[PDB]
Amino acid sequence: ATQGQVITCKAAVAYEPNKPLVIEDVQVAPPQAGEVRIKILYTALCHTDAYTWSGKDPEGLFPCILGHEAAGIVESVGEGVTEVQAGDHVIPCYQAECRECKFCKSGKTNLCGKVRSATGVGIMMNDRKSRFSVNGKPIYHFMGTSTFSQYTVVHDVSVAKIDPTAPLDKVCLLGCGVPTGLGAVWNTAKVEPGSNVAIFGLGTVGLAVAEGAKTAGASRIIGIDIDSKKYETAKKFGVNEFVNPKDHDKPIQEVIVDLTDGGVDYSFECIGNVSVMRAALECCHKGWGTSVIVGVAASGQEISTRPFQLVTGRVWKGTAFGGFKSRTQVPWLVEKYMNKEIKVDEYITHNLTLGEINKAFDLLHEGTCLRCVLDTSK
Amino acid sequence: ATQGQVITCKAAVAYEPNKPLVIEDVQVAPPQAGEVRIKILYTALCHTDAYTWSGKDPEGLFPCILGHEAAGIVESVGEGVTEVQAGDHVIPCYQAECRECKFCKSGKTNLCGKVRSATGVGIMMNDRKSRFSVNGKPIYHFMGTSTFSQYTVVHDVSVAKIDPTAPLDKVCLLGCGVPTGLGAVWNTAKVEPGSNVAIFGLGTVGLAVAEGAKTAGASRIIGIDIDSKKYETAKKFGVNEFVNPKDHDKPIQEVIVDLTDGGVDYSFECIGNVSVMRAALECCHKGWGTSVIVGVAASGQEISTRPFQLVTGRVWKGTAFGGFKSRTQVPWLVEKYMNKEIKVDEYITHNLTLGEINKAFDLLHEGTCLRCVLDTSK
Ligand SMILES: NC(=O)c1ccc[n+]([C@@H]2O[C@H](COP(=O)([O-])OP(=O)(O)OC[C@H]3O[C@@H](n4cnc5c(N)ncnc54)[C@H](O)[C@@H]3O)[C@@H](O)[C@H]2O)c1
Ligand SMILES: NC(=O)c1ccc[n+]([C@@H]2O[C@H](COP(=O)([O-])OP(=O)(O)OC[C@H]3O[C@@H](n4cnc5c(N)ncnc54)[C@H](O)[C@@H]3O)[C@@H](O)[C@H]2O)c1
Numbered sequence: 001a002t003q004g005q006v007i008t009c010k011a012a013v014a015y016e017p018n019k020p021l022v023i024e025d026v027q028v029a030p031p032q033a034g035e036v037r038i039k040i041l042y043t044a045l046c047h048t049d050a051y052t053w054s055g056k057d058p059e060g061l062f063p064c065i066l067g068h069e070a071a072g073i074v075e076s077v078g079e080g081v082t083e084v085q086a087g088d089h090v091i092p093c094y095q096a097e098c099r100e101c102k103f104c105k106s107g108k109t110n111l112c113g114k115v116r117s118a119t120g121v122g123i124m125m126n127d128r129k130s131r132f133s134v135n136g137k138p139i140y141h142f143m144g145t146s147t148f149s150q151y152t153v154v155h156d157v158s159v160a161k162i163d164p165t166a167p168l169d170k171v172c173l174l175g176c177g178v179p180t181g182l183g184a185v186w187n188t189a190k191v192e193p194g195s196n197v198a199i200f201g202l203g204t205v206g207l208a209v210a211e212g213a214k215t216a217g218a219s220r221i222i223g224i225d226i227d228s229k230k231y232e233t234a235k236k237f238g239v240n241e242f243v244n245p246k247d248h249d250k251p252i253q254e255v256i257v258d259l260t261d262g263g264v265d266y267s268f269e270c271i272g273n274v275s276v277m278r279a280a281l282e283c284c285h286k287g288w289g290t291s292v293i294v295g296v297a298a299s300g301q302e303i304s305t306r307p308f309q310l311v312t313g314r315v316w317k318g319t320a321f322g323g324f325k326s327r328t329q330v331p332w333l334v335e336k337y338m339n340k341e342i343k344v345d346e347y348i349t350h351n352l353t354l355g356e357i358n359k360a361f362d363l364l365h366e367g368t369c370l371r372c373v374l375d376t377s378k
Numbered sequence: 379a380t381q382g383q384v385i386t387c388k389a390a391v392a393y394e395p396n397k398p399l400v401i402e403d404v405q406v407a408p409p410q411a412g413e414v415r416i417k418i419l420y421t422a423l424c425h426t427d428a429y430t431w432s433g434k435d436p437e438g439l440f441p442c443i444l445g446h447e448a449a450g451i452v453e454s455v456g457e458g459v460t461e462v463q464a465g466d467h468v469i470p471c472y473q474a475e476c477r478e479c480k481f482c483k484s485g486k487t488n489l490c491g492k493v494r495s496a497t498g499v500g501i502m503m504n505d506r507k508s509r510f511s512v513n514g515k516p517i518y519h520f521m522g523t524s525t526f527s528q529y530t531v532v533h534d535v536s537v538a539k540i541d542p543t544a545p546l547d548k549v550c551l552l553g554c555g556v557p558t559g560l561g562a563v564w565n566t567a568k569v570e571p572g573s574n575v576a577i578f579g580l581g582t583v584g585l586a587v588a589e590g591a592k593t594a595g596a597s598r599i600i601g602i603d604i605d606s607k608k609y610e611t612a613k614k615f616g617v618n619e620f621v622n623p624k625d626h627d628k629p630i631q632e633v634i635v636d637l638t639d640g641g642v643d644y645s646f647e648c649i650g651n652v653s654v655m656r657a658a659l660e661c662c663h664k665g666w667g668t669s670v671i672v673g674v675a676a677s678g679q680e681i682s683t684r685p686f687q688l689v690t691g692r693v694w695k696g697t698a699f700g701g702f703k704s705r706t707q708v709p710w711l712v713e714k715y716m717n718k719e720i721k722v723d724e725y726i727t728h729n730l731t732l733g734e735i736n737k738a739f740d741l742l743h744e745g746t747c748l749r750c751v752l753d754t755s756k
């Protein structure tokens with residue numbers, strides 16, 4: 001009977017970079033003002049988690065509970081919370097939507113800064129402390145989500161309330177990769193019917209770009225990956241031509257320009273590699289081509305190109321969560337999934353349990369793997 | 379009457395890089411199919427001319443008649459030419475508008491390909507020879523215009539027909555820097571009323587961006603220049619705040635972010651320096667800020683930034699001629715000038731003659747000089 005009480009539950013704790021997560025019992029404090037305590041039923045993992053786990057993220061902060069892609073059920077809410085209540089089905093999101101800041105009220109972006117000063121340093125806004133502990137010492141939150149746990153506490157501005165019949169072992173992916181890819185196409189680029197598109201990197205994000213392009217009515221949807229086995233899988237997501245840059249001595253941008261008689265209308269970089277980001281811009285058609293950076297580069301890395309590439313009409317842009325407003329639009333994407341208008345299930349290549357989370361980290365180095373989903377009950 | 383005849387007239391010839399131009403009598407042959415022979419009355423000089431003159435082009439062609447900003451009076455036309463005729467007042471343009479090629483049919487007439495195989499190597503399409511010679515030896519065309527001459531011959535798709543009452547010693551500017559600046563605002567960026575703008579470089583182009591932005595209804599129009607005495611004339615064009623980067627220890631981008639509590643809505647680089655291009659991007663506001671590189675720089679260098687600047691909502695663009703279609707829209711700009719809706723006179727700080735053209739090249743380093751206009755009659 002949990003309202004207002006500390007909850008003791010299982011969670012995967014990362015104590016040190018690049019070592020195995022240990023599954024412990026942890027204490028989850030109750031939600032203060034503006035906060036929501038969530039029973040997490042299913043959580044996926046992705047490169048973003050492993051980046052921090054690996055020690056490579058200069059923002060990383062150990063020990064922490066990682067995880068940002070999940071779906072669950074609200075256990076309780078703190079004072080003032082009105083948009084969700086106990087028993088609501090929810091997707092916690094790493095990107096907030098407070099609806100009250102200069103960014104939210106602007107109408108020109110989805111990038112809300114309301115809680116980022118707490119969440120970027122693994123704590124809560126209300127008291128600037130953590131809600132997680134083991135043996136009475138604090139464990140940092142991660143991305144404002146911390147979903148590698150049976151229970152988490154998040155800010156109310158980061159909770160999307162969803163269709164209560166949607167399957168929670170599928171819609172956990174609607175918190176990260178899938179909306180990023182779809183939205184890079186529909187919101188950031190605004191791809192028109194008949195456009196030709198190049199997609200660099202055919203993982204989950206690239207594949208969501210491909211589905212978003214197919215749905216928007218693109219013609220040629222050219223996939224580029226250094227692993228040729230990715231093409232067969234990518235076909236069902238709408239990729240219809242494939243190039244492996246290893247199969248050519250010329251730089252990949254030149255190859256794509258020759259293949260398309262001038263370059264593509266839109267390109268999307270879905271890797272996080274600055275050299276490939278430059279190639280993606282340079283394979284765009286002059287006059288009107290646009291390149292959207294979706295990949296997240298490591299610290300200190302820079303993109304470059306020649307000014308003439310922009311002067312002759314190419315446009316360079318990028319996307320954060322596909323340009324979607326998380327609380328307002330994640331529930332819309334869940335609706336679309338329930339109506340069979342967007343794919344989600346096809347991206348889930350493995351199902352494990354939270355107990356087996358280190359095995360899921362190994363699975364990240366398998367080229368076949370797109371998303372792993374974890375059942376947190378074991 | 380000179381129609382059908384070779385004309386002999388004064389021109390300034392560049393025999394090789396870096397030497398003084400030679401004010402010679404040259405022979406200008408009559409126009410062939412699709413060509414127009416123009417009596418040039420006034421011509422200005424800009425950096426683009428100096429770039430080739432100084433040898434700073436991989437391989438310019440010498441000897442040549444430089445010059446691309448001019449106005450005059452058609453002397454005769456070749457076979458097939460219908461849009462202009464003898465006695466028409468005209469502005470020859472380095473940007474063609476053929477209306478018939480793949481680029482023109484999409485709208486991007488600034489990529490028109492009709493005559494560039496000839497103009498790019500200093501000759502005419504009809505016979506792949508030049509129309510200029512001295513003592514029987516060929517002198518190459520430049521930028522398809524060659525305006526440092528009493529008479530020139532250009533392709534009809536490069537000729538704008540203008541209001542015959544407009545002053546030729548003023549509208550000679552409306553073929554290059556002024557449209558590029560105005561058009562960077564109105565066409566490339568599409569600046570909205572109330573926008574905050576930063577403009578890097580307050581020469582002719584930056585002043586044209588300022589006026590564009592003023593006319594478009596911008597609020598803060600912040601000019602940045604290393605020469606503080608550029609601000610005085612800038613205020614007449616609409617600049618209403620000024621920063622000299624030399625007055626600050628922090629890089630300029632940070633100073634502009636601090637001045638505007640986050641960044642401007644639009645920035646414009648009007649210099650051609652890749653490190654200022656980066657600063658112009660990095661001083662744009664998170665979420666929506668857009669930076670335009672204004673004009674072909676010919677720097678031969680790379681622009682760089684961290685891809686986070688684009689992931690978090692900044693957009694990078696550029697423009698060659700402000701998005702304007704030369705033949706259709708240069709005459710519209712002349713009408714706007716005639717109706718006092720844009721300035722042209724205030725750019726002209728110096729008046730010399732074609733005889734004195736080498737003194738005009740000296741002025742290109744003069745802080746005080748914006749455009750110098752040359753009267754070709756002596
Ligand atoms: N902008 C955002 O909001 C946002 C949100 C989520 C994820 N991401 C980013 O998107 C990226 C993709 O994540 P994912 O889960 O699909 O990753 P993933 O690892 O499943 O896929 C990466 C793909 O890129 C391919 N690849 C690697 N190097 C390559 C190269 N040089 N040329 C061509 N292909 C290459 C791999 O073979 C793999 O198929 C990551 O950078 C991640 O940070 C961004
Ligand atoms: N295609 C070419 O060959 C070529 C070469 C160079 C420049 N250009 C074009 O020249 C155009 C500008 O022409 P203009 O006639 O206005 O030039 P201009 O020389 O009259 O003006 C340039 C202004 O920038 C200022 N400036 C220089 N360095 C600076 C810095 N680091 N920070 C801030 N201010 C600085 C100078 O003081 C000057 O006022 C640009 O559009 C550029 O694209 C073309």
Ligand SMILES: [Zn+2]
Pocket residue numbers: 045046047048049068069176177
């Ligand atoms: Zn993720």
Ligand SMILES: [Zn+2]
Pocket residue numbers: 096097098099100101102103104111112113114
């Ligand atoms: Zn907000």
Ligand SMILES: [Zn+2]
Pocket residue numbers: 423424425426446447554555
């Ligand atoms: Zn010029």
Ligand SMILES: [Zn+2]
Pocket residue numbers: 474475476477478479480481482487489490491492
């Ligand atoms: Zn054309």
